[PDB]
Amino acid sequence: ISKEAILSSPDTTEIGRVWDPLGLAEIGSAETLAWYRHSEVKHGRIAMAAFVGWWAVGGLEAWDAVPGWGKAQMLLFAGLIEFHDELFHTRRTEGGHYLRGGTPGKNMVPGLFDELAKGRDREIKNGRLAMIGVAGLYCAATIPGSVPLQ
Amino acid sequence: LSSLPGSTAPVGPFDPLNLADSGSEETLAWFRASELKHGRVAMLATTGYLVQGAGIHFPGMLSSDVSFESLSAMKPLEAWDAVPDAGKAQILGTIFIAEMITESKPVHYTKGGPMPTMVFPAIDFSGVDAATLKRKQDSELNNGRLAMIAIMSFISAANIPGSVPALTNNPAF
Amino acid sequence: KKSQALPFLPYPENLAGYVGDAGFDPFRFSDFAPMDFLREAEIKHGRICMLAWLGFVAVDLGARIYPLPEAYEGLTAVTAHDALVQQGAMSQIFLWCSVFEAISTVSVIQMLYEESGREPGYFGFDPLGFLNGKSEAEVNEMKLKEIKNGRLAMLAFSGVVTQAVLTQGPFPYV
Amino acid sequence: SINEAFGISIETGNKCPPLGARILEDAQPSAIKWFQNAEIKHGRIAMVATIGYLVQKLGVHFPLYLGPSGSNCFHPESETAWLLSSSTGVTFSDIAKAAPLDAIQMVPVAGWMQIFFVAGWFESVAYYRQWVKNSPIPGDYGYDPLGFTKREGGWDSEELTSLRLKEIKNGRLAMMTIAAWVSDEMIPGAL
Amino acid sequence: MPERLWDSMVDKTERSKAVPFLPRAVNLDGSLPGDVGFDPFYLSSIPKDFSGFIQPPQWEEKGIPTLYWMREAELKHCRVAMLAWFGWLATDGAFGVTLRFPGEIYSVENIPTAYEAHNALVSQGSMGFLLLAVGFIEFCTGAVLVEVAKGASDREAGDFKLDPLSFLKGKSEEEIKRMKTREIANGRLAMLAFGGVATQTALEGGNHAFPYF
Amino acid sequence: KVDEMPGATAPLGKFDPLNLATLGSESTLAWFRAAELKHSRVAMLATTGYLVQAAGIHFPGMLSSDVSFESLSAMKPLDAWDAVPEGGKNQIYFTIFLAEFITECKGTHYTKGGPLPTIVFPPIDFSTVNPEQLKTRQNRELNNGRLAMIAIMSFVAAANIPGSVPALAGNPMF
Amino acid sequence: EKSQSLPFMNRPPLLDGSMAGDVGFDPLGLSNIDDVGIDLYWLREAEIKHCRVAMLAVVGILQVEIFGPAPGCEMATDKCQMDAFWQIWGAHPQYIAFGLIMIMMIEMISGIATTQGRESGERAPGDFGLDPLGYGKGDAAGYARLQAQEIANGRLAMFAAAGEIMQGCTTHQGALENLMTALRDNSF
Amino acid sequence: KDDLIAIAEKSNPVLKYYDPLQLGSTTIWGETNSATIGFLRQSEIKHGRIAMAAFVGYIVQANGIHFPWPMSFDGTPFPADAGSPPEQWDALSDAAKWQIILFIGFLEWFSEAAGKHYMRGGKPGAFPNFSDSDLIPHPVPLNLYDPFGFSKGKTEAQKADGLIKELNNGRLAMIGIMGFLAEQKVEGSVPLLKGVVPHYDGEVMAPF
Amino acid sequence: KAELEAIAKKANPTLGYYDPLSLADKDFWGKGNDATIAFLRQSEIKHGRIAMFAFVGYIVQSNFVFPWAQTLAGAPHPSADLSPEAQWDAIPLGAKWQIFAVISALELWDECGGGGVLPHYTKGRKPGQYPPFTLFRDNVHFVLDLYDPFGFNKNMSEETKERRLVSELNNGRLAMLGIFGFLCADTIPGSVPLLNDIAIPYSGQVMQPFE
Amino acid sequence: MVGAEGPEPIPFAPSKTSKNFDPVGFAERSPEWLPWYREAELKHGRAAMLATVGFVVPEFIRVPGEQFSFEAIPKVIDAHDALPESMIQIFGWISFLEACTFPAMAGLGGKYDRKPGDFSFDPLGLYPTDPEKQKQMQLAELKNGRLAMIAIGGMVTGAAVTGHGFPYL
């Protein structure tokens, strides 16, 4: 995957161009841009599920009510997901790893997931909003009072 | 020299001690930028002394504990001492960026480059009809020259009473 | 060239051939000792801690032999050494370990200095019928599983016995 | 060679006086240049001293104002007393009243160190332009504010030659006169 | 009874210009700026390698001229004492303003005159930081004397390239020498001036304040 | 140069009995003409300023906040300067200094090959470009200024020594 | 040829601008040392390690002085990070001892990589192959800027980390409140 | 630049080209002089167009024109019960002001993104029609400029003269709406509007 | 320069061309002599034709006013007080700004040159000539011309208007001191007549509310 | 070489004369010490000349300080001990001048061309040009210098034995 393949998704209508004010896509190779895209979609897809989980239980005090066996169970189960994710990227993909030959969004673990490239643009954009949204629900909800002002 | 801006009608060019030949052409280029920066600072200093000395102040609070009214009750040189130290750090930090930016141009003014232009907002005054820019550069320096005498009279009248005969019984001094 | 585990270091050339080869020998122990001696010491250390981890974490999980001797009672996995040197249970296992190691002293000396062609860690012990005419790439895939689980158990036992005498608590630290 | 030096003229018949020529006739040309410079330099101090005595024998102290009640030469009293020293408190009105010889003692010592420093700067400029840069004219200390010495040029002209003889002779008149005026301040000897 | 070192020190056919009865020192040529031939004790004619104090002579074979070391030492004494006599008088209020740092450590109510500023700030710690800052500068600028002593450098004595306003950038060799003489002449006087201030304030008569008499 | 300059009139052709024109250089005479003309223009303002302040005519109405113009019109004009306020004399001494600083620093000084001092503010100078008419006009400025130099010395010799002039010293203002 | 940083001095001979932050600043001639296991390779590896250690020390102090200790380390509560070490060592000394022995295994391997990388030529000093994102794979002019930005930020952080040690050990306050009391003391 | 002189000559044949500050010969973001001269034209046209609607919108909302029906879920009509239209903007709500500001912010966005930009091949002030440009997914029935179609068929010389009397009616309404708001904060600011304007005395240059 | 001396050949051949200050050869603002010689012609033409406009504004504003309204507040005139130079103050200040707005616009149109129709007087145009309103009348609405709004003249021969230009400034400068024989006749007056007028605002030019 | 003339008859030795006066014979015994002897004779002669003036002038005039007045120090013979703070400053500045002649003393033989006693000090130009009366100018410095060497012993013991005015009692 090259730099022009990474920057061809998602669409850049709502800003106008590819929005890189610091020029961070110009520093490095196509490998360090594939790391940026894979970590954008991983940050996005977690922040989407983190937003609804606020209103599904609505704050941080529910995490304090999780026991020592409870925190260690889910953190290593998510670690078991992310272990075999980068494993099946390398071993079970026709191109290879996302930094070597694979898709930076492919997220290969069987069972975690269950017109499509148009849905790729709707995944990064819907996760870009939740990244701002859960940054709202951590800062505006908790740390100072009058942030949003919503 | 006389082709330079600052030489005007009554005494032009004015150099009785011949300080322009005391160094090189890079020393005179430093002297011109130091006269221009001393003028721009003292023009804001003379106006800042007259506006704050009149009683003209901004409405409201400068800090959470210091009002603009409590500073305007004092003489202006004593009003700087009661500005908050977080406020002076904001002033000097912004001046630090302005001095670092106007020095880091691709050609230095000591080597024939441009003199300090506006940092924020970065308005471009390049193609502004150099015949008019020549006359306005003479008026910048002449208003700078007078305001450098003016602010030195203001510090002298505030400390040595009767040193400036026009500011003897002036209440702002 | 350029050792895999340590890519900033050159590859130690005496590791070539053996099966757990990650190029990890920065202290260059293979340049001092023969690699048949070092591999035999690694599999023997690993086979002990595979048993010693399973023997530590089963005893303090309550598993005892049946019928339990009355001198074996009231002991955790920490206390079981000093209480059973007095009983003589440790001298019984040390006897039969010394019997096997006296024969394996002959086989190690024959391996390094008499050229028996014996692989390090080989004892001919496969009664359950693994390696049934298998390819040597499939046998080496099993030798890597012995050493990697062996290397894991050496650090696993080292934690379960240090955290045991640090806390003297329940199973996940003792 | 002392009897063919510059400052001789018709007052002694173009002859150096014999007691003075007996000192410098068997001497170097630098001995003549030394004594000629010291005669002019003593004549310069004595020239401004006869006027400084006439200012002191009168009351023409600061501030100067030709109108009445302004301390001019006609009416020597003032109304302002311009305060020569502020830390001491003495004015020019006080020093104009006492005496010629007591006027010097009323000047503060910090005022003399401003005079002797400036007179000390001038005397080392006078030494550099006369002796180090070896000037052929005695008394030529490079001081000419109005540009008389750019006359023809240069020094070999009758206008600047006669001015040199005019300076030495008027300095010779003023050397006797300040010695005759401050003698009578000490002891009456106006013979 | 051996051949005297007197003949190696003096020119024996030329007199010193400042002291006309003494013969001229062999290293004083008039080419240096403040040179009027004043060396009545013939300290430029001392045949020791005075760069041995920085780097010892047993490190390698090297040798600096004695006049080069003395002029590097005279110029450092000139430039230190010019700043020092100025900084003594500026912090004492001799030029009107009692110029002090904004900190209360350096205020007039803590340090009343510049006479007491040494011992009051060795105790506080400002003089210990100046010793580090000067020592860092003296280590990076003092090692050029070894490069001159080995003959590898054509650098003149006291001749860093420190002309930020560039007064001597296009000037001729004659007016550069006049500017170097004005540095030397004002530096020689400010060395004697600092000798005046630091000694007259140290007497039992006192007057730690300006004008120090 | 003393032939090629104004000041030569018909009663005395080139009046110099002490030959002080050719005593110095051209620069010395150029200093003398600049000092005769400056003494002329001061004394012409001085002779006018004595007569119109002895005639009693004055400005309305208050010079300072405390000092009226009519208080100074009663006394003699040489004594009226003592009653001008110190802030007012400082205003006079500043504009006189600023005019003397400008005329000696305007380019090509009069002691060199330059012009004599002109009007400082406003700079026009009203000079006739016709050299046959202008030379008579500046020959008129000099001897009117020469007479005014003698006149103001007669006004201070009548205000200090009673007498000294026949047509004055009977008047309570001179 | 003269040095850039000290233009009165000749350029040091082993410094030729090939390294990142090279402006010829070696007045003592320390790059000419070749005797006690020390040469320019050893001094460059020492500078680069002093750069990277001090860079992590500045953001390590500023992380706890702004946001507090990590969860699990809540018993520190001291803004002086020199003092907050002794409360974690008083409470959980095993993690600092686990980190010290893991540094000991890393550093003894790094000492072998330095000396074997010097007698060979197959390792630049400070090079460990830790480029997992892949900045060195393209734009060699932009990679030389990254090599220069590491040296420039690390040489600045060396003074900052040494200062935070010394003015933490003498004021017992904390770096950011040492900065705030320096602002209100020397304000004009 | 050559066209900007030709525009301002038809706006005034006495005052042909007026520029004291010579702002027409500058750049802003380093584009070129000809691209920022379309920025200055667009900003002048937008300033005048807003102030033209603000002047009619002032005299409607200063008199009593509260139109039925109030569109809310509880009541709370258009707050003309103060009246004094700078006070009237404050008394809407806090949450109603973001609906007005963000709706204009789409029109500010759509004039930038869609068909042709004023810092390029120009025609500044030309609002792109909603029917084209394929960016909005609704689609919407009407356009902003010609919703009813009035009046297509006018020639180019009939519409070239329109912007010139839009610029002059836009320049005057800039002076017009500020003369109202100056007397809302200082009396005697405009001489002929004394007593009419009720001195809002707050901050007109702040929304919330 | 020479054409100014040609006017003095026609103005008064008894006295003649006469500059005591010699301002015909000076320069103002560094803009040259030929621009200075036309600033001086325009200024005394402007000084004279205002004074002639004030000399008839001093002989009928004493004796005859129109009485109708003068404001929308009652008191329906400044109530003469037949001295004309005291009638200016109570007019009131709102009317003085409207007078100072049109003269600010009328003298704006003079130095403009009529939108560029006429050149400027320092650079070529005849100095007494006001630029016509023909370029404002072409665009906005029908405004009357300043000099001759009806078209009575342009019937003249060409040689009659230079005969009338020299009659204009000759009548102009007499009315300059002629109108200054009236307001100077009110503050320590000084004349043989006695009696015409008395008042004391004395000048300059607004009163009780300003500054 | 200069001062060996006369006629000057020797007092209390009526046969001998001042012509080549060296009865001990230092010019014959140690001729290499002879430029040292002339430098020492001139330095003794010049210091004793200023001492003869310095023993008579402070009997009438005093320097305007009040620690030098006649009420503090009545007789000149007590001025060396009553003013130690000024004798140190005379000694300290002579020490600088005398150490500056140590390289001139190190070359008093045939090292360089400086005549003994000649310090190149003639600002007033009084040294004549012709050598036939340069020697009698040198001879007068020796005779006046030798006489003041004798006389300052007569002035001091003349005022120590009989404490009186100038001539003596």
Ligand code: CLA
């Ligand atoms: C010089 C570096 C340095 C040092 C000595 C410390 C030390 C400390 N930190 Mg700090 N910290 C650092 C940098 C450092 N930190 C950095 C860079 C950050 C991110 C900004 C932090 C953020 C941070 C937080 C939020 C907290 C601490 C806390 C602590 C204290 C307890 C933690 C501990 O001991 O971990 C045990 C050690 C380990 C778990 C492993 C150490 C690292 C191993 C050896 C890998 C090193 C690899 C190396 C970096 C690069 C590769 C080298 C080679 C391959 C070339 C301890 C005194 C806590 C505290 O108690 O504050 C009072 C706390 O809450 N630190």
Ligand SMILES: CC(=O)O[C@H]1CC(C)(C)C(=C=C/C(C)=C/C=C/C(C)=C/C=C/C=C(C)/C=C/C=C(\C)C(=O)C[C@@]23O[C@]2(C)C[C@@H](O)CC3(C)C)[C@](C)(O)C1
């Ligand atoms: C004595 C007598 O008898 O009279 C009587 C009767 C009477 C008639 C009633 C009187 C009156 C009324 C009078 C005379 C009133 C005053 C009249 C007058 C003469 C008023 C000048 C205004 C000048 C202005 C506004 C300058 C703008 C100039 C400006 C803004 C600029 O310079 C800048 C600029 O241009 C440039 C330079 C460059 C460009 O890039 C930018 C622009 C375009 C901005 C009196 C005096 O009361 C008494």
